[PDB]
Structure 1
C-alpha cells in the first residue's frame, strides 16, 4: 500500500482488511506472501566467478595479444622441423600468462567482498509481529514479514520494513533515520496522515522506514511495503540502474590499444612495398595452392616484436603493490585500477552525517553561574573535548584542564544530566566501541558525566564495559528516582522527581531535576543557583544567560542548547496528577536555573586537516547532505570548507534552491558552491554528473543508503567502514578505520603508482621498436635474421620483467602531492617521450644487426662475408658461385643473434637506469636512487648468462656465448645510447620546457 502515509490509520487497516488487535490470520499471511513475495531485497552480490574472467579477457590489449596468439598459432603450425623444438611453445606461453592474469584479478574481487563482509550480515534480521496465530508478539525472520502485518517496535529495534505507525505506546516516538536521510537529530513521529502525496521521506512523520532504528519509545504499526518496494528497496534498484561506464586508468590502456592497433596498418605499409614487385614476373610454380608461405609469416614475426608483452603483468603487479600499501593504512581497495585512479581525482565529494561527521551526539560546551552582584552577572564557561560517546576527553576552562568536582555548580549540573535521563551508554564488546542506549541527545549527557567525574571516582583500573557507567552509577546512588515526567512537544522539557537516597543527606528533601529548550525552562525559573546558594532571577541575570545561549545557538558554534534546572521545593506526589503530560509544565515551575550544555554531531578529528591538504593539492571538497542547511553550513565552517564568518549566499544551496536554478546555472553552481543540503539521493548523483561533465575525476564519500547512487557514479566511491552495506558494495574503497585522512594518503599513493606506471611502459616497449627495425632491415633490405621470435620473447618477458615491477619501488619525489592533479585527457606517451623512446628505440637496431652482424663480417671468428652477399644470403643455395663461401647454413648461425640479443638486453638494462627520470640527467638523478632497479639488472643479467650456459637453454634459444672481444664490441655499440639520451634530455631542459 504505497501512499499509506497520506491515508489515515483506519484506511490502512481497512485496505488490508486486518484487525489491529490480533493481526493477520495465518490464512491471510499465506495469501499476502503469495501476492507480494517475501520481505527482502533481491539477493544481491552479482557478477559470478565466471562473469569476472569473461570481462577480464575483454581488455583491448589482452584481446590483441590473444588474437595474436590465433595468428601466431597458424604460424607455429605452418613451421617445419628447423627450430620448432620450442617454436610451438610460444602459444602455450602467451595463453598461460592470459589465465595468469584472469586468475589474479578474479582472486582480488572475491577477496574484496570478504573484507567488505565485516560483521555486516553477521547479525540475523528479526521482526516482531502480532498475528492471529497467538496473543503474544512473535519474533520471526524479517524476510517473512508481509505488507498488512501488525508490527511492534521499541527502543533499539531496527525497523524491519516500511511501516505506517498505528499507535504510539510511549509519550513520544523517536527515530534515527540518518542511515537513510542523513538526518543529524532523531525525528519525533506522530500518527496523523501526511496529506501531501508528494511528501519526501523527511516529511513522512507517520512512517517508519526499514533499516532505520528506534531512538526512543515504543510503537505499533502496519507494514506498508516490503522487498524492493521499500525506501531502501527503491534506492537499491535506483543505484543498480545507474551505469559504471568505464575506468579512469583502464581508459588509458584502452587508449594504448591505439599505438599498437595502428602499427597493424603501419606494417601493412612497410610490407606493401615488396608485394607489387612480384605481380610483374610470370611464374606458375605454386599459386594459391603452393607458393606464398613467407608473406603471412613475418606479419606476426614483427607483431609479437611489437606488443610489449610484459606490461599487463607489470601493471597488475605494481598496482597491486599500491593496494597492499593502502591496506597498511586500513585502505581496503575493492578494485586494482582505482588504486591509481583516486590519484587523478580533482574533486572529492563527501557526505555529511555519518562520513565527515562521526554521527554521535556529543556534549562539548557548558556553563553555570559564577557570581551575581546587582546588574553584574558572570558565568563560569567550560569546553569539553572528545567527539564520540566514549568516556574519553577533558573539561577545560580558558583552554586548561580543570577538575569539574571543584565547582559545586558542576556537581549539580552533572547530577541533573545523570538523573534526568532515560538513556545510557554501553560498550559493545563485539564491535569494540561504545554505543548509545536510547536517545542520542541523552546519551550525550551520559558520556559528559563520565568525562566530568565530579566525585573523582576511580576509573583507571576499569574495563571498557565498566568505564561506561562508573560515574553515572555513583550519582544514581545519591537519589532515588521516584518517577519521570517524559518530554512533551508543547512544554519542550523533561523532568524527574527524586527523593533522598543514602542517609548521608536526608535533610535535603524531594527534588525535581529539569532540562529542556532554554527559553521555556529559563522563563519558568524564579531562582538562579550560584555554587551552592541561590539568588532570585533578575532581568540582568536572565539577560546574560540568554545572550550566551544565543551566541552558542548560532555563529561559529551553532550548538543545540539545553537549560538544566531543579525545583528545590517540589510538590508532594499526592498533589500531582501524572497521567496527563498537559499538567507537567505547571509542575516544572518556580525552578532554580543551574546551567546550560551545548551539543552537536561532531566532525571527525582528522577532517579539517584533510581538507587543508586537499586544497594544497588542488582538490576541491564539496559537502552533499540530506540534513538541513543550518547544520550543513555549521559543520562546513568547523571543518574549514567555509570561513568562520564567510557569507555563503551562492555557495550553499538546498535541494529546492538548486532545482530552482536553470540547468546551466546548476552545472555552474557545482563548480562554485561547496555545500548542498536537504538534497535527495538522485541530487547527489546529479551533482557528481555535473562535475564529470567538465572532465573532472570525482570521488564520493558516504555511509548511508542515500549515498549509494552517487558512490557508484563517482570514478572512485569511498565508503565508511562503519557505514551501510549498500554504500560499501557501491564503492571501490572502504575506510575500515573511518579515517578521512586516509583518503589523502590514497590520493598520494594513487599518484606515485601512476607516474612510475607510465614509466615501465616506456622502457619496456623500447625493445619492440629496436626489434622490428631489425626484422625490417634484414627482410626487405638484406642481412639474415639478427634475432628470432622465441628469442626476443624471453627478453621482453623475463629479461625486462623484474626491472619493471622494480619501478614499483621507484622512489616518489618529496613534492608529488604539493602539486595539482594531472590532465583528464592528457595522453601519456608522446611529444618528447615518443621520440625519446623512438630514438633510443631505433638505436638498438644499429646495435643489433650492427654489433651482431658485425660477427658475420669483421668478427675475428665469424665468416667474413661481404655486405651484399649477406643482404642476398637468400640466394646462397643456388647462385652460390656469385659468392662461393662455405656452408649456406652459417647464415642461420646462433652467434649473430646472440650478439644482437645481448645488445638488446644490455641496452635495456641501461635504459632502465635512464627511464628513471624523464628529463633529469643521470648525473643529477644518479642510478642508485632506486636500489631495486640495480638489483633487477643484476638478476636479469645473471639470467642472461644462464640462458647462455645451462645446456638445455642455449639449445632451444638459437644463441651462442660471445667472446670478450665480441662483448667489448657490444659495449662500444650499446653504451653510447646513454650519451644520445643524456644529450636529448639536455636539449629538453635548456632550449625547451623540460
Structure 2
C-alpha cells in the first residue's frame, strides 16, 4: 500500500481486510508473501578474488604480455633432459610479474564494501506481529513480515518495515529517523492521516520507516510496505541503478592500451614487409624472438606499481590534512573537480549558533511605531556575555517586554546547556538553535538571580530554572514544517500574578507567527496589531536577515487567553496552528551561525582555481543569498536573480530550465534531498566533475552519483560508505585543500606517465633497427624487464615528489578530454623515442664495429648473414659485451631523461636537477643496481652481460648525455615559438 499516510486508520484496514484486534489469517500471510515477496533487500550480487583476478587478464595488454609468454615457451625446446641449468627465465619472469601485477589491482586497490551492502545493517532481524493463529505478540524473523499484518514496536526497537501507525498505546511516541536525516533529536508521531498524497517524509508523521528506532513510547500499526518498496528500500534501488563511470585517467589509459596493442600488431607485420639448406622450423622461430622483444619493449610493465605507489603515498598525505580518501583512484579525479556543492551548517559554518540582536516594541501611537532594540555579546554557548542598548550595557530585567522575551525563550524551549568538566567548556543539549535561546535567557538574567556565586555546572541552566519555577509546562505542540512554529501550554504555580487565564507561548519563524498576531505587547500593556506596526516589525526582520549580519530570526508571541484545556485535540497536529492563533507579538530574537574562519579564503581559492562553489541550505532564499555574499560566493553588490533558487522555485521549472539553471546556479535554499540527485545529474549533462556533500541515507543516492561524494567525520555510518572522501573535521576547506593536492598528484602523474612511456617508444625503435637492419638484438626481454620495473622504476616514483607550481591553483580545472600526449609533446617524445632507438643500437654494434678488445669488423655486413651456413666472407654474435653496451646506454639516458621530466617546459637551467632531492637519490640507487647486476656473478650471467671497461663507460656517456641537449632545445621552442 503506497499512499498510506493519506488514508485514514480505517481505510488502511479496509485495504488489507484485516482486524486490528485479530490480525492476519495464516492464509493471507501466504497469498500476500506471494504477491509482495519477502521483507528483505535483494541479496548481494557476489564477488571473489579469483574471478577478480580473471577479470584482469582479459585486458588487451595483459593478453599480449601473456601471448609473449606463450611464445617465450615455444622457442626454447621440448620435454625433459638434463641440465644447461641457465635457461627458462624469459618466460618465467613475465608470468611471475603478471601474477604480481594483477594482484596489485586488488588487495591495495580496494573494491569491496559498497553503500548498498551497508543498507543491510539497518534492516532488522526480528519483528513483532499479531496474526490470527495465536493471541500473543508473536515475534518473527523480519524477513517474513508482510504488507498488511499488524505490528508492535516499543522503546528501543528497530522498525521492521514501513508502517502506518494504528494506535499509540503509550503517553506519546518518539521515533529516531537519524539514519535517514542525521539529526540526533527524536520526532513525535501521531495517527491522523496526512492528507496530501505527495507529502515528503518529514511530513509523514503517522508513519514509521523501516530502519528507524523508537526512541520512546510504544505503538501498534499496519505494515504499509516492505522489502524494496519502503523508503529505505527505495534508496537502495536508486543506488542500484547507478552506472559508475571510470576516472578520466582510467579512461584515457584504457584507450592507450587499445592503441598500444594495435601498434604492436602493426609493427609485427611491418617487420614482415621488409623481410640454402635446412628446414622450415628455425625461420618460423626467428620472427618470434623479435615479436616477444617488441612485446616487452612497448609495455611499461612498471606503470601499475608506480601509480599505486603514488596513490597510496597521496592517501596518507591528504589524511594529514583531514581528508580521508577511501576509493584509491579518486585521488586523480579529485584533481579534475569542477564544481563543489556544500551544505552550509557544519561545513561552511561552525554550527555554534548564538543570539546577538533582539527587539521588542517601545511605543505605538497612530503611525509612530518605535522599536526598543538591544544587542548581545558572546559567540559561545557559555552564559558569559552581556546585553547592550545604544551600545552600552543595560540591565535586561528593567524592560518589561524583555522579561516576556526570556520567559518564552525558556518555557517554549526543549533544549539546555551542560558544563563539560573534561574540555572545561559548556555543551549544547538538543537543538543548536534552541540551546542558543537557553544561553540567552542566562545572559539576560531578567530577575537578577545571584549567579556569580554558583559554579560552572550549576549556573549553566540557572536563570532558566528560576523561570521554570514561575510557570508550569503542561503539554506542548511540536514544530511542523507546515505551520513553522511551536508552542507550549503553561500554568501558574506559587504566589505569583497570573490568573483567569493560562498562556500558550508560541515561538516560530517570523512571517508565520506575526500573521497570527492580532495584538502587540507594548511593555506589560497590549494594543491591537496594525499595518504600520506590522510593517516596522517586518522591516527590521528583513534587515537583520538579509543584512551583512545574516541573522536567523524568531518571532516570539503568546496566546494571552488560550482555549480551555478540554477543547484542543492534542493528537491532531493539523489543528495545532488554530490553537496558535489570536497571538500577541512580544518580540524577535535573531541569531548567527558563523561561517568557518577558514572558508572565506578557501572560497576565493576556488575562484582563482576556476572551480564553482554551490551552497545548499535551509535558510530562506533571502538569508541564503546574504550568507553567500558574506562568504564570497557572490560579490557584495552584484546580480544574482537567476543564480539562487529555492526548493519550490526549482520544482516549478520544466526540466530544460532546471538543467539550464544548474550551470549558472550557486545557491539552493530550502531544498529536498531529492534535488541533490537531480542537481548532480544536471551538472554531469555538462561534463562537469562534481564534489557533493551530504549525510544521512537520504543523501546516499547523491553521494553515489557525484564523481566525488563527501561525508562528514561526525556523519552517519551509511553516509560515509556512500562517499569517496570523508572530512574528518567536517571543514569545508578540507575539501578545497584535497582538490589542490589531487591537482598536484595528477600533475606529477602526467609526468612520470610520459617518462615511463618515453622509454618504451625508444626501446621499440631500437628493436625495430636490430630487425630492420638485421643485426643481433641489442636488447633482450630479461634486460628490458629490469629497466622498466626497477631501472626506470625508482626515478619514475621519485618523480611523484616534484615541487608543485606556485600557480597550481591559479589555473582553471583540467578537462577530462585532455590527452596526456598531444601536439608538440607528441613530436617531442617521438624524437626522444627516435634517439634512444638509435643510441642503444649505435654504441652496441659499435662493439662489433669500432671497438678495441671486441671483434671490430667495420661494415662486415652483419645484415647479410647471422646464419654462418657459408662462413665464406670470413658465436661471438651471442657475446655479453655488446648487449652491455646497449643496456648501459639505455639506463644512463633514462636517468638523464628522468631529469628532463622534473618540469614540462622549464630548462634544467631554470629548473635545477637538484630541486627534487629524491630524484637524484633515486638515480644514485638506480646505477648502484646497474653495477650490482654486473659483478655479483650470478646476476651478469643471468642477464647475459659482462662489466664494461673504463673505455666502454665513456662511450656511453658520449652517446647518452647528448639527449639532455636535444631535450632543452624542444623546451625553449615550445617556450618561445609555440606560445600565444
Question: Does the pair score TM above 0.5?
Answer: yes
**Counterpart in 1 of 2:819?**
827
CA distance in 2, matches of 1:537, 1:724: 46
CA distance in 1, matches of 2:717, 2:535: 50
**Counterpart in 2 of 1:950?**
936
**Counterpart in 2 of 1:185?**
185
CA distance change for structure 1 residues 269 and 579 in 2, over 3 Å: closer, same or farther?
Answer: closer
**1:209-224 to 2 correspondences below 5 Å:** 209-211=209-211, 221-224=221-224
CA distance change for structure 1 residues 581 and 868 in 2, over 3 Å: closer, same or farther?
Answer: closer
The superposition leaves residues 930-989 of structure 1 with CA deviations (integer Å, 9 ceiling, x where unpaired) of: 111010001101111111111111111111111222212211111111111112212221
The superposition leaves residues 331-361 of structure 1 with CA deviations (integer Å, 9 ceiling, x where unpaired) of: 3323222211121122334567897788998
- Contact 2:758–2:833 at 8 Å: present in 1 too? yes
For residue 929 of structure 1, give the secondary structure of its aligned residue in structure 2: coil
The superposition leaves residues 181-237 of structure 1 with CA deviations (integer Å, 9 ceiling, x where unpaired) of: 899999987655566756665775654444567899986532201221112212211
CA distance in 2, matches of 1:769, 1:486: 72
Give the unaligned 5+ runs of structure 1: 276-283, 883-888
- Contact 2:116–2:240 at 8 Å: present in 1 too? no
CA distance in 2, matches of 1:533, 1:982: 88
**Counterpart in 1 of 2:468?**
476
Shift of residue 794, structure 1, vs aligned partner: 1.0
Moved more, 265-274 or 73-82: 73-82
Moved more, 18-27 or 817-826: 18-27
CA distance in 1, matches of 2:450, 2:106: 54
CA distance in 2, matches of 1:736, 1:63: 42
Shift of residue 243, structure 1, vs aligned partner: 1.5
CA distance change for structure 1 residues 235 and 332 in 2, over 3 Å: closer, same or farther?
Answer: same
Alignment pair present for 1:291 and 2:277: no
- Contact 1:108–1:335 at 8 Å: present in 2 too? no
CA distance change for structure 1 residues 395 and 322 in 2, over 3 Å: closer, same or farther?
Answer: farther
CA distance in 2, matches of 1:832, 1:639: 42
CA distance change for structure 1 residues 342 and 95 in 2, over 3 Å: closer, same or farther?
Answer: same
CA distance change for structure 1 residues 678 and 213 in 2, over 3 Å: closer, same or farther?
Answer: farther
Shift of residue 240, structure 1, vs aligned partner: 0.4
CA distance change for structure 1 residues 902 and 392 in 2, over 3 Å: closer, same or farther?
Answer: farther
The superposition leaves residues 252-299 of structure 1 with CA deviations (integer Å, 9 ceiling, x where unpaired) of: 210211441232243134312343xxxxxxxx8566566422022211
The superposition leaves residues 691-715 of structure 1 with CA deviations (integer Å, 9 ceiling, x where unpaired) of: 3344333333332444334433333
**Counterpart in 1 of 2:236?**
236
Moved more, 827-836 or 851-860: 851-860
- Contact 2:552–2:590 at 8 Å: present in 1 too? yes
- Contact 2:155–2:214 at 8 Å: present in 1 too? yes
Shift of residue 9, structure 1, vs aligned partner: 1.7
- Contact 1:500–1:509 at 8 Å: present in 2 too? no
- Contact 1:770–1:844 at 8 Å: present in 2 too? yes
- Contact 2:934–2:946 at 8 Å: present in 1 too? yes
For residue 122 of structure 1, give the secondary structure of its aligned residue in structure 2: coil
For residue 843 of structure 1, give the secondary structure of its aligned residue in structure 2: helix
Alignment pair present for 1:913 and 2:913: no
The superposition leaves residues 746-791 of structure 1 with CA deviations (integer Å, 9 ceiling, x where unpaired) of: 2212211112112112222233233233323233315433222212
CA distance change for structure 1 residues 728 and 3 in 2, over 3 Å: closer, same or farther?
Answer: same
Moved more, 683-692 or 760-769: 683-692
Moved more, 740-749 or 866-875: 866-875
- Contact 1:763–1:837 at 8 Å: present in 2 too? no
Give the unaligned 5+ runs of structure 2: none
CA distance change for structure 1 residues 904 and 240 in 2, over 3 Å: closer, same or farther?
Answer: same
Moved more, 92-101 or 969-978: 92-101
For residue 118 of structure 2, give the secondary structure of its aligned residue in structure 1: coil
CA distance change for structure 1 residues 804 and 449 in 2, over 3 Å: closer, same or farther?
Answer: farther
CA distance change for structure 1 residues 144 and 193 in 2, over 3 Å: closer, same or farther?
Answer: same
Moved more, 284-293 or 686-695: 284-293
- Contact 2:181–2:698 at 8 Å: present in 1 too? yes
Moved more, 503-512 or 353-362: 503-512
For residue 792 of structure 1, give the secondary structure of its aligned residue in structure 2: helix
Shift of residue 489, structure 1, vs aligned partner: 11
Moved more, 864-873 or 929-938: 864-873
CA distance in 1, matches of 2:257, 2:422: 50
For residue 271 of structure 1, give the secondary structure of its aligned residue in structure 2: helix
Instruction: Work out the number of aligned pairs and report it.
Output: 980
CA distance in 1, matches of 2:280, 2:419: 84
- Contact 1:556–1:644 at 8 Å: present in 2 too? no
CA RMSD after TM alignment: 5.7
CA distance change for structure 1 residues 289 and 74 in 2, over 3 Å: closer, same or farther?
Answer: closer
CA distance in 1, matches of 2:773, 2:899: 33
- Contact 2:351–2:432 at 8 Å: present in 1 too? no
For residue 379 of structure 1, give the secondary structure of its aligned residue in structure 2: strand
TM-score (normalised: structure 2):
0.81
CA distance change for structure 1 residues 561 and 44 in 2, over 3 Å: closer, same or farther?
Answer: farther
Moved more, 252-261 or 620-629: 620-629
- Contact 2:362–2:369 at 8 Å: present in 1 too? yes
Shift of residue 919, structure 1, vs aligned partner: 1.3
- Contact 1:59–1:254 at 8 Å: present in 2 too? no
Moved more, 950-959 or 419-428: 419-428
Shift of residue 406, structure 1, vs aligned partner: 10
**Counterpart in 1 of 2:131?**
131
CA distance change for structure 1 residues 475 and 986 in 2, over 3 Å: closer, same or farther?
Answer: same
The superposition leaves residues 359-392 of structure 1 with CA deviations (integer Å, 9 ceiling, x where unpaired) of: 9987665335689999877656567799999999
CA distance change for structure 1 residues 737 and 10 in 2, over 3 Å: closer, same or farther?
Answer: same
- Contact 2:124–2:160 at 8 Å: present in 1 too? no
CA distance in 2, matches of 1:722, 1:395: 34
CA distance change for structure 1 residues 772 and 341 in 2, over 3 Å: closer, same or farther?
Answer: same
